[PDB]
Each structure stands twice: as C-alpha cells, then as structure tokens.
Amino acid sequence: PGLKIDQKIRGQMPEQGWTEDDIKNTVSNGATGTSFDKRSPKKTPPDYLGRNDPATVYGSPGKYVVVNDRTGEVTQISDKTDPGWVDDSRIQWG
User: Fold this and answer.
1) Region 1-94: CATH code
2) Fewer Cβ close by (within 10 Å): the C or N end of the chain?
3) CA 45 → CA 11, 17, 25, distances in Å?
4) DSSP β-ladder status, 63-68 and 74-77
5) Residue 12: exposure state from Cβ atoms within 10 A (0-12, 13-18, ≥19)
6) Per-domain residue ranges for the chain?
7) Residues near 68 by Cβ (< 8 Å), separated by ≥ 6?
8) 51: how many CB neighbours lie within 10 A of its CB?
C-alpha cells in the first residue's frame, strides 16, 4: 500500500519481466533478505538527492525486489529474463 514505484522503475518493468501485480505478489511472499539502498542522486527521481537507507529484499536470486525501509520506494527489480543476472552486492539473503 505504501509501495512507491517511480518512473525509472515503471520503464524497466515490461522489459525485465515484471508487472505491478507481480511486484505486489512477490512482496506478499515475505521478506527473504536485506540490504541497503545506496542509489546515486541521478537515480532517485523528483528528489535527486540520493539515498542512504537499509532495505528489505523480496523474492529470490535473480528474481527479486528491493524496497527502501524508510521510503517504501522500490530501489531495484532484477531482470528476470537475464539468466546471468548478478545479484547486487549489498543484498544479504536470509
């Protein structure tokens, strides 16, 4: 409900195999890990000030969603169509 999807992420969803319902269903499956949202200013829309927050990971390796604990913003959706996808280094699987 407090989930925020910016325009940058909205643009990547259809190309990386995600739908808004897909993101909600994945989050509903429960937290599977943790990490940090260290996005650069250029990647934090209508704000552009960058992020420095802890985050929760949903899904599984290569098929995940990262949500900023403070903002509720989605920091990253992995590319489900890329089998060689490397997980972001900040992700800690539980």
Assistant:
1) 3.30.2310.30
2) N
3) 13, 22, 25
4) antiparallel
5) middle
6) 1-94
7) 37, 51, 53, 55, 74, 75
8) 19
Q: Are 70 and 49 in contact (CB under 8 A)?
A: no
Q: Backbone breaks in the chain (C–N > 2.5 Å) follow which residues?
A: none
Q: What's the distance, CA 1 to chain centroid?
A: 15
Token output for 43: 């990647």
The amino acid that residue 54 corresponds to is P
Element (H, E) at 7: helix 7-12
Both structure tokens of 90:
């900040």
The two tokens of residue 7 are 């325009």
* Resolution in units of Å: 2.3
Structure determination method:
X-ray
